[PDB]
Design a protein around this ligand. Sequence first.
Ligand SMILES: O[C@@H]1CCN(c2ccccc2)[C@H](O)N1
Lengths: 300, 304
Amino acid sequence: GFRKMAFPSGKVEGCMVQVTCGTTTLNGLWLDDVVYCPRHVICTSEDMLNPNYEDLLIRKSNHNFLVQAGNVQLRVIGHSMQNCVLKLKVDTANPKTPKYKFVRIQPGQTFSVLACYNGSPSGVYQCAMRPNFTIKGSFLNGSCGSVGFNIDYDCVSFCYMHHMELPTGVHAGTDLEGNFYGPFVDRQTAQAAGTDTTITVNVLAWLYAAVINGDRWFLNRFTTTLNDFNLVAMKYNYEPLTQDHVDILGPLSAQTGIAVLDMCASLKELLQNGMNGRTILGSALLEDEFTPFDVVRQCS
Amino acid sequence: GAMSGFRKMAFPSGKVEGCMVQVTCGTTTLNGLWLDDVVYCPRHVICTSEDMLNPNYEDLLIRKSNHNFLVQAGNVQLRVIGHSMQNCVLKLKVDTANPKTPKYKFVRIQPGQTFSVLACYNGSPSGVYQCAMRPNFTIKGSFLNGSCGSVGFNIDYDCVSFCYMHHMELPTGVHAGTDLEGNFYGPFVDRQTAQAAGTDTTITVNVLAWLYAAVINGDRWFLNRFTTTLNDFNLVAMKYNYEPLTQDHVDILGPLSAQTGIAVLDMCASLKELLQNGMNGRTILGSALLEDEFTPFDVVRQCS
Ligand SMILES: O[C@@H]1CCN(c2ccccc2)[C@H](O)N1
């Protein structure tokens, strides 16, 4: 009985708004007296290929920005651009503003996404930053302007904003300061995501989760050296494993008594021989969207 | 296409977050649902540690007065003014009506249908997940220590349909519970006596809708050229522990059948080949597993 969970989305729900520039409509994040949204909302049908965003920006008037929060309309006062994020300053501060911080995450860390359409929240899901810096999600998993977040002691950490739907069923976007995740541009040009890989630290964290839940058949008597594991793992499209990840797994190593490189011999053996029709925590597949600290959060 | 790399989503939990409270009777603390002037919670909050095998709820309840119930809404304390029992749900009338009460209904679901769960510690929401009422009337849930009182719901046009409440963890690691009228799902009792869940089965109708969703989005490698009779399909499915398929499930799938031009029974023959051959490393809609927790209602709603 181990299931993936998203954060309670209430505190982010009361921040989504609908931003409309000319013909284009998408989601905004209304915080204090500022609305954040992707900067490509200003792209016309003629600049949508090769725009000089800051010069296009300075020529738009505030009045070309429609902002509604449900039935209420918001007054745009000014606008500035920070990287690929548009910042529209409004006359009203959001009284539903949670306590928040802007953070940037690393490939392999998890967060929840509140999927929104035209400002209206539609659903919520947990995901991980893929090593190729993309996030799994169809057009039905929330369109441009939806945000990704973690909650740390009732404080929201916004880390992600959806910008564009890639052809491969994944989407890409930025942090809330506008910097893209991965080698992507907000220009409607042919663009492809790199070959993905399995988040190796997360699989080990998930294997520790099985051991906490008494699922133990995969554990063996063997260890392995770090790179004697890495060599085998990259041949299966697994992320190489750094000394940082080992340390991060330390606390789980101390609760279960399974050294990190011991569990690495279990996973390495799982890679070459498969699960032989057995199961771990109910799944015939290895999960890699549980960080070490999602396990400690949900198991302590 | 539309649903390439599609993920299940739980509904936004905000409207439920504003209804969760902490209910305490003596030494037990669990979650309550505060809707208007009444808070709902599982009745086994009034059990002691000796009462858990054969609790006499009617004896236990009548011995309790309003001021033995400790209802905490965040940082305010609510005053209990009345208290009655409807099956296994306890109902605490409070003097103060929840301002954050959403539009809501109480509905009972059938196995195979889906909803979201807001998992809570001590009145405090901890997470949200999307799941299905399994065919054996249990909920494969999170390894949360005291989720009792966590509710399940769907949301449809600002209106929250409450359909589940968590009462107990079973030895098999899944959860069992009631509707908001206190009737359990399945043959379970709110007693700490030996209770086992029947053998789980794959929600066949859900898989077929999922397979129809793939075909809508050009994912097409699993289709074959065969049809099957309904009863020839049902007979093979069962030795793979798949739910038998009823004519009603065939009708439910009819809209998917017409938009793709693939007869339902043809899709059943394609499924039957997937069972004898398997998905060993291959993907359907980005998933390396056959999804059985996405209903035909959400497929046709989301793929018009
Ligand atoms: O999940 C656990 C298991 C079941 N539950 C319980 C307590 C008293 C009588 C019957 C059931 C307990 O409070 N919570």
